[PDB]
Amino acid sequence: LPALKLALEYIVPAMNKHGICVVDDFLGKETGQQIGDEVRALHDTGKFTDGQLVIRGDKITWIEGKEPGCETIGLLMSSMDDLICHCNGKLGSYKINGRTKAMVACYPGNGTGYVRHCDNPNGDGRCVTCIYYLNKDWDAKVSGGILRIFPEGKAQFADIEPKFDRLLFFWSDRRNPHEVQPAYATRYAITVWYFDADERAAAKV
Amino acid sequence: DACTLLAPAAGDTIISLCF
Ligand SMILES: O=C(O)CNC(=O)C(=O)O
Ligand SMILES: [Mn+2]
């Protein structure tokens, strides 16, 4: 899959038309596994704390990608960034000029999850959500942990399985209310949000 | 509107991007 062509050819039309975009097998088996190993490596540290709101049953940690031993995570973020900036101007009307750090989040199992919410209800500047799923051979039927999105204007449901090496894009605003149904198995994911310049200016005001 | 105000903390810093 040509990196920069995938954007204009799939992610851009998919996101504009339907509002959600999924890219399976983004990097490959060995890459994804190196990411997972680095993540669980971080998981043994014990530096994970409870997730925060602007209910949610995950423990997370922020990664900038510049940390030693997180080289592969940084590689991922560099890819996502290259894609975004390459898209810039084409995604809806957005002009993306920033992003958050990476949120490495873990659901312990035990049925905890994230109640129905919206990532940017108040217009804080976040216009796109990216989530990288690295959970290998995840059996949703028994493991739950499904991401259910309720698209605005569409009658159908959007059910995302946290499959390993899966990349997820969607509008962060009120167009995509989502929830993480109870997870009965360890559920790891890496997130990052992308900021629109103008809306970002509005939030300061 | 099926939204809720229970948004994930956007975090602490923002990273410059593209320009
Ligand atoms: O990890 C997922 O599938 C969904 N997570 C969230 O909606 C969040 O962290 O705010
Ligand atoms: Mn969310």
Numbering used by the authors:
A (entry chain A): 188 to 241, 251 to 401
B (entry chain C): 395 to 413
What text appears in the publication on this structure?
The ferrous iron and 2-oxoglutarate (2OG)-dependent HIF prolyl hydroxylases (PHDs/EGLNs) catalyse trans-4-prolyl hydroxylations on HIFα subunits, thus promoting their binding to the von Hippel–Lindau protein (VHL), a targeting component of a ubiquitin E3 ligase, and signalling for HIFα degradation under normoxic conditions. The PHD-catalysed hydroxylations of HIF-1α/HIF-2α in higher animals occur in amino- and carboxy-terminal oxygen-dependent degradation domains (NODD and CODD). The three human PHDs exhibit different NODD/CODD selectivities, with PHD3 being substantially more selective for CODD than PHD1/2 (refs 16). Biophysical analyses employing crystallography and NMR reveal that the molecular basis of PHD isoform and variant selectivity involves enzyme–substrate interactions involving β2/β3 loop residues (that bind the LXXLAP motif) and helices α3 and α4, regions which display sequence variations between the PHD isoforms.
We then used a ‘disulfide cross-linking' strategy to form stable PHD2.Mn.NOG.NODD complexes, where PHD2QM1 (C201A/P317C/R281C/R398A) or PHD2QM2 (C201A/V314C/R281C/R398A) and NODDDC (L397C/D412C) are cross-linked via appropriately positioned cysteines. NODD makes more hydrophobic contacts than CODD with the C-terminal region of PHD2.
